[PDB]
Design a protein around this ligand. Structure first.
Ligand SMILES: COc1cc(OC)c(Cl)c(-n2c(-c3ccccc3)cc(=O)c(C)c2-c2ccc(F)cc2)c1
Ligand SMILES: Nc1nc2c(ncn2[C@@H]2O[C@H](COP(=O)(O)OP(=O)(O)OP(=O)(O)O)[C@@H](O)[C@H]2O)c(=O)[nH]1
Ligand SMILES: Nc1ncnc2c1ncn2[C@@H]1O[C@H](COP(=O)(O)OP(=O)(O)CP(=O)(O)O)[C@@H](O)[C@H]1O
Ligand SMILES: Nc1nc2c(ncn2[C@@H]2O[C@H](COP(=O)(O)OP(=O)(O)O)[C@@H](O)[C@H]2O)c(=O)[nH]1
Ligand SMILES: [Ca+2]
Ligand SMILES: [Ca+2]
Ligand SMILES: [Ca+2]
Ligand SMILES: [Ca+2]
Ligand SMILES: [Mg+2]
Ligand SMILES: [Mg+2]
Lengths: 438, 351, 54, 418
């Protein structure tokens, strides 16, 4: 058994992590006080669920997680929430004044002040690890702490933990819930600094989650609670293979080797189905072919893009519940005829499939319906570069006038890092274009 | 009131559509890179599709289909027809064609068929074309393969070699060649609308089968006919014959009608091409919708068989028909998505 | 369509479905860059307080 | 926890500041004696931003009251809430400034400035994490005009990494009561351009027309105008005084509003269905500064809605105005309109909308002032009152040039394209 440590950075990273771990406990039957009756090994064990949870001699199960924000209003909710018991205080870290939606303020000014304290608390978790797989880093592109401090921590983690893998769960900015005008700057800068330090990064565009909550859950004006509830489901299905017995994606290294043949193109597109409203007392339960076919509709993707106009380099299917392989092969064969699925010449046209008999778990009182079978598809398609193009265009319009740049320079950063970061994304966009276009 | 943006100022078709929308009093035009629009009349190359459908509270529509380039460019179209079960390497209405790169390639296969029919002494007049050439140039007709394959290595852009139609239908008086242009509108629902009116683009010089050094008698483009021939304008105004007159000629000279002999094949070819690519370009479940106007070019042989020669994703109309077609675009492709305040000119091809 | 490497256990089941075959900076560098940005901040604050003293 | 320090200077600043504390004390459930008697508990979650907590669970404003004459100081203490202020935070002189910018900045205000900073320092040391300062004052007088910008210059030297906000009453196009206001305003604007992060432009003629035309107050008074300002000042600080994430602190607000450092002068607005509110707040007739938003373009905008309302309706209505009037929003700052909502409404209203706009049309105000200023300075009219306090003519020339530069800059971005 090898361990994984989750790091939640900023407001968005913390609150998503606070939803993921509530969902992890429900899946494994861990109570808010950390007691798991079903664990017959007290004070220890090398079970697969122990990859994400530590154990104490008293019978408590403690997440292998660290929460860091540069202001306490968010983390103090964790210290008082339903699962305040679950964690111990060394895992929760707070500043006093935030990065003010400023990448440079969180990276240079305030990052330098608190980086060493964070690594020490991370080191405390690693000292309890017999074999450490790597890290799972939850953060946002737009926030000052999410973009600035994360990219700094990624650099140090590549040093203090040189050969260990790192996975990002990033929140691509969406104007309908965005709190800052300079998020395009923060996204380009943090992506540039973290590109060579992240082995696999699952982007989530809040636009897609927002519209899914409006379309499929009939929520008039979704909130972060609504968005996080759904994000936790996608995160859980992706990390399920690390928390349960299996042979697919049981190691952080498998994510890279199965999904990332090209180091820089390490941004897979997640697609999830079915998203059904619980207020619908009952619905016709969907077949394996139906939910599998939903995975190729853009309306169910985490980033609104058109995979038909790109090329796949890898594809994985993660089912949960009443699913048998014969149903999957029938669904795949029939789908391949009606859909426009094109792989790169230098990769086989295949699908790595994982099934887990435990049906998806939903939070009580939430907006999501209990379903008996669900699926999440992780495909490394070049069409996700549409997101980079969108974000780069917004960056270009503002930087043509040097709008807001003085806020970054006043924090010690140089105007060169704007051009240097932008050029990297220009190369990344053209890297995506060589692979996926004729 | 709705908003729209113009990004191809050279489009003569959508220039009049722009004039029509403003005359509506219900459409305001914004400037090139203002992103808060309902309708984009976009550019012709590198249109940013990835940025559409991401403006909250704005149903965005665009006048091009992403992926149509696979059908509207010679090298792409040849590969599309041969490599699709729908259209079948054994296709009847597309001339025997081959994609050839100067200096994935098919040069070796083109020669296989060339010698195969000089063994049987069948005609070997082939033509080489490409999307790089224009203005009546970038094109060569010859019976000897060596003259053509040397001519392509003389270039630097991919070309296609196609079996020249040696026995075309010749209009009399004049004993002259021609091709047919049909305009097709595909809306966001992917309804295929054929414009009732087509045009015959005419050669004003008799078709000389002996000497191919002469261009004008073989190429029927409205450019070369106006520019390398004085008899341009003798028989019909601007070397443009319209369907009502062509219908009469077929009846009077061949005891048939335009509908039966020719038009029914045209509608079949249009359906087959577009329906083949619907899965790859349809936007009925996307965040942004599409429509596009296509111009199909056809050749007719002496047996009254219809052949397809190319497709234009960004075509131009005929001066007599701009008013009628450009207003039909508004009612069927634009006003269908963005209603206005309160007989048909199109043929709907069912599937 | 081949179905290879089928692994089967109590919690679930994993396999592959082929349809067609084919055809970092040092710690010293980090501290140095963070210091250069602190210097740039102090020079700007010095020029400010200098103009306020004036 | 993130505490703001309030300062009010001059007769104008103190009068406006006093009614500001009347409005928000009521909103947070504080009575004149300093004790909380409210219903909800969101009133106290961020009370420490503007109030210090003292022994006996009494809340005292973190406010400093300044003026060179004691008159208006005595009116503040006799007002409704005059009992609430810390008596040691009244720092007053006896001479007055006589509408002389040089007296407030250089001679009469200089003798009193250190006594003010001593109160400022004592308040700031009692802050868990000091956030910034806000000042209320006029630019036409001598105390709030001249001494106000001196305090701003002094405060930056002690707290250079803190945000500096101001609520500044600007001279009006057609109504004035002081002859030398072009000199005092032009000299203050020169200071604010350099030493403030955010400035709200208020002129009285716009307020008076509202009071007379819209609210139908047949004989308006500075009392009626100040009630408008305090209501607006409450609206612009709602996101700072109540739980939220959007523009929740002064620096975050400044980072979303100020694309270029010198162009930080804002046009406030207030109103009064959801579609009705959104239409009003954008109307010129609801602006507190005498500049037509249709004579420029918005660089950035911030809207705050208060009360119980359908966020779906609000979000949908904000987007319509943006997409309806695309010509008046810069194309090169995408998504430059940010909307926030608070469940707490103001008193008397159930739904309110406050508007903060950074429009290039503000240059019109700086042009009006420059034209008036040059007309006086070319003939050196009334200048002996200033040179007599020690000023040189070149301090006037520089102040004029800087404002003319500020006008040029505003035009530069008004015509910029993509
Ligand atoms: C700004 O310069 C002023 C000039 C002026 O007379 C030309 C007046 Cl009356 C006022 N003024 C005064 C006042 C001031 C100084 C001496 C005596 C009376 C008191 C008062 O309550 C209100 C509402 C106003 C006022 C404000 C803005 C207007 F558009 C119209 C009237 C102000
Ligand atoms: N999905 C989701 N997105 C969030 C959440 N919180 C913030 N965001 C997004 O994150 C961006 C703003 O960054 P934040 O995470 O709030 O700020 P931060 O990371 O704490 O950085 P600072 O404000 O400087 O401290 C916006 O684009 C929001 O849409 C959340 O809880 N869920
Ligand atoms: N296989 C073939 N058989 C007979 N004639 C042919 C032919 N291919 C092309 N032609 C002739 O050559 C001419 C030009 O061909 P083509 O249509 O490719 O030019 P083009 O692409 O510039 C037309 P447009 O300007 O509308 O895009 C046509 O008018 C046609 O008559
Ligand atoms: N809103 C408002 N403005 C005022 C008031 N008193 C004065 N002013 C404005 O301030 C200017 C006079 O300056 P004053 O406040 O006396 O400056 P001081 O010398 O610093 O006190 C006039 O142009 C008015 O517009 C008031 O009670 N309310
Ligand atoms: Ca155990
Ligand atoms: Ca690495
Ligand atoms: Ca004295
Ligand atoms: Ca002293
Ligand atoms: Mg934050
Ligand atoms: Mg062509």
């Amino acid at each position: 058994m090898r361990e994984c440590i989750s790091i939640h950075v900023g407001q968005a990273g913390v609150q998503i992590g606070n939803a993921c771990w509530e969902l992890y406990c429900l899946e494994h039957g861990i109570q808010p006080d950390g007691q798991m009756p079903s664990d017959k090994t007290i004070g220890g064990g090398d079970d697969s669920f122990n990859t994400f949870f530590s154990e104490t001699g008293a019978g408590k199960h403690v997440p292998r997680a660290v929460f860091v924000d540069l202001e306490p209003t968010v983390i103090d909710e964790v210290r008082t929430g339903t699962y305040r018991q679950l964690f111990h205080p060394e895992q929760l870290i707070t500043g006093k004044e935030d990065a003010a939606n400023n990448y440079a303020r969180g990276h240079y000014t305030i990052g330098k002040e608190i980086i060493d304290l964070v690594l020490d608390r991370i080191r405390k978790l690693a000292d309890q690890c017999t074999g450490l797989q790597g890290f799972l880093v939850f953060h946002s592109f737009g926030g000052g702490t999410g973009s600035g401090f994360t990219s700094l921590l990624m650099e140090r983690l590549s040093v203090d933990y040189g050969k260990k893998s790192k996975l990002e769960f990033s929140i691509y900015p969406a104007p309908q819930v965005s709190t800052a005008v300079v998020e395009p700057y923060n996204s380009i800068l943090t992506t540039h600094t973290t590109l060579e330090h992240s082995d696999c990064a699952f982007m989530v565009d809040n636009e897609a989650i927002y519209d899914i909550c409006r379309r499929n859950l009939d929520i008039e004006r979704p909130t972060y609670t609504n968005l996080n509830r759904l994000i936790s489901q996608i995160v859980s299905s992706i990390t399920a293979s690390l928390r349960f017995d299996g042979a697919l994606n049981v190691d952080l290294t498998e994510f890279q080797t199965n999904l990332v043949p090209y180091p820089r193109i390490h941004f897979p597109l997640a697609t999830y189905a079915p998203v059904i409203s619980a207020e619908k007392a009952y619905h016709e339960q969907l077949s394996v072919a139906e939910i599998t076919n939903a995975c190729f509709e853009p309306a169910n993707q985490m980033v609104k893009c058109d995979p038909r106009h790109g090329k796949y380099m890898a594809c994985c299917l993660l089912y949960r519940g009443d699913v048998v392989p014969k149903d999957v092969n029938a669904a795949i064969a029939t789908i391949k005829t009606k859909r426009s699925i094109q792989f790169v010449d230098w990769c086989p046209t295949g699908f790595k499939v994982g099934i887990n008999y435990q049906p998806p778990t939903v939070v009580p009182g939430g907006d999501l319906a209990k379903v008996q079978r669900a699926v999440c598809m992780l495909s490394n398609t070049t069409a996700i570069a549409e997101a980079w193009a969108r974000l780069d265009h917004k960056f270009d319009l503002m930087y043509a006038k040097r709008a807001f740049v003085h806020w970054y320079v006043g924090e010690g950063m140089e105007e060169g890092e704007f051009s240097e970061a932008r050029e990297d994304m220009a190369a990344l966009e053209k890297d995506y274009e060589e692979v996926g276009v004729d | 009131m709705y908003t729209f943006v113009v990004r191809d100022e050279n489009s003569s078709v959508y220039a009049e559509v722009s004039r029509l929308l403003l005359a509506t009093g219900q459409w305001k035009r914004l400037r090139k890179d203002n992103p808060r629009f309902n309708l984009m009349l976009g550019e012709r190359n590198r249109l940013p599709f990835g940025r559409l459908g991401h403006e909250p509270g704005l149903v965005q529509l665009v006048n091009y289909y992403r992926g149509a380039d696979k059908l509207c460019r010679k090298a792409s179209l040849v590969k599309l027809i041969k490599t699709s079960p729908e259209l079948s390497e054994s296709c009847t209405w597309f001339p025997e064609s081959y994609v050839i790169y100067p200096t994935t390639d098919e040069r070796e296969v083109f020669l296989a068929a060339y010698n195969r029919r000089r063994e049987g002494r069948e005609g070997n007049v082939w033509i080489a074309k490409s999307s790089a050439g224009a203005k009546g140039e970038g094109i060569l007709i010859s019976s000897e393969a060596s003259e053509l394959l040397d001519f392509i290595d003389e270039q630097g852009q991919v070309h296609v070699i196609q079996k020249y139609l040696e026995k075309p239908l010749l209009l009399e008086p004049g004993h002259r060649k021609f091709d047919i242009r049909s305009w097709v509108l595909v809306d966001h629902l992917y309804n295929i609308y054929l414009y009732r009116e087509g045009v015959l683009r005419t050669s004003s010089e008799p078709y000389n089968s002996a000497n191919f050094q002469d261009k004008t008698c073989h190429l029927t483009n409205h450019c070369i006919q106006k520019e390398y021939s004085k008899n341009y304008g003798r028989y019909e105004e601007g070397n443009e014959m319209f369907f009502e007159e062509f219908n009469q000629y077929l009846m009077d000279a061949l005891n048939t009608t335009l509908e039966n002999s020719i038009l029914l094949q045209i509608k079949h070819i249009i359906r087959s091409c577009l329906m083949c690519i619907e899965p790859a370009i349809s936007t009925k479940h996307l965040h942004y919708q599409s429509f596009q106007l296509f111009g199909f070019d056809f050749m007719v042989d002496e047996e009254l068989k219809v052949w397809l020669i190319e497709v234009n994703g960004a075509p131009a109309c005929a001066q007599k028909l701009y008013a009628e077609l450009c207003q039909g675009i508004v009612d069927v492709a634009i006003s269908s998505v963005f209603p206005l305040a309160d007989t048909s000119i199109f043929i709907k091809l069912h599937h | 369509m081949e179905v290879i490497e089928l692994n089967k256990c109590t919690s679930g089941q994993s396999f592959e479905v082929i349809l067609k075959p084919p055809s970092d900076p040092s710690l010293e560098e980090i501290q140095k860059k963070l210091e250069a940005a602190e210097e740039r901040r102090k020079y700007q604050e010095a020029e400010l307080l200098k103009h306020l003293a004036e | 926890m993130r505490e703001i320090v309030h300062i009010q200077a001059g007769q104008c600043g103190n009068q406006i500041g006093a009614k500001f504390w009347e409005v928000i004390s009521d909103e947070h459930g504080i009575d004149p004696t300093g004790s909380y008697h409210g219903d909800s508990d969101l009133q106290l979650e961020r009370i420490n931003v503007y109030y210090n907590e003292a022994t006996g669970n009494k809340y005292v404003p973190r406010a400093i009251l300044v003026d060179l004459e004691p008159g208006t100081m005595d009116s503040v203490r006799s007002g409704p809430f005059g009992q609430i202020f810390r008596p040691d935070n009244f720092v007053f002189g006896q001479s007055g400034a006589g509408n002389n910018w040089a007296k407030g900045h250089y001679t009469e205000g200089a003798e009193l400035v250190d006594s003010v900073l001593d109160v400022v320092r004592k308040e700031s040391e009692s802050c868990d994490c000091l956030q910034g300062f806000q000042l209320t004052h006029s630019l036409g007088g001598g105390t709030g005009s001249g001494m106000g910008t001196l305090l701003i210059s002094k405060i930056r030297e002690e707290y250079p990494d803190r945000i500096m906000n101001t609520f500044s009453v600007m001279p009006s196009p057609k109504v004035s009561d002081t002859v030398v206001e072009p000199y005092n305003a032009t000299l203050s604007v020169h200071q604010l351009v350099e030493n403030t992060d955010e400035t709200y432009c208020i002129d009285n003629e716009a307020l008076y027309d509202i009071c007379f035309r819209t609210l139908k107050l047949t004989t308006p008074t500075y009392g009626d105008l100040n009630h408008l300002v305090s209501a607006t000042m409450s609206g612009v600080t709602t996101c700072l005084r109540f739980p939220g994430q959007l523009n929740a602190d002064l620096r975050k607000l400044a980072v979303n509003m100020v694309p270029f450092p010198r162009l930080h002068f804002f046009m406030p607005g207030f109103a009064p269905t959801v579609p009705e509110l959104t239409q009003q707040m954008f109307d010129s007739k609801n602006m507190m500064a005498a500049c037509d938003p249709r004579h420029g373009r918005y660089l950035t905008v911030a809207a705050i809605f208060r009360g119980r309302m359908s966020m779906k309706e609000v979000d949908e209505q904000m987007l319509n105005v943006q997409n309806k009037n695309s010509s008046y929003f810069v194309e090169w700052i995408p998504n430059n309109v940010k909307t926030a909502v608070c469940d707490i409404p103001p008193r008397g209203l159930k739904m309110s909308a406050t508007f903060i706009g950074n429009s290039t049309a503000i240059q019109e105000l700086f042009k009006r002032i420059s034209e008036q200023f040059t007309a006086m300075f070319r003939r050196k009219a009334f200048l002996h009152w200033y040179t007599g306090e020690g000023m040189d003519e070149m301090e006037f020339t520089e102040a004029e040039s800087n404002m003319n530069d500020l006008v040029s800059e505003y035009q530069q971005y008004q015509d910029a394209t993509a």
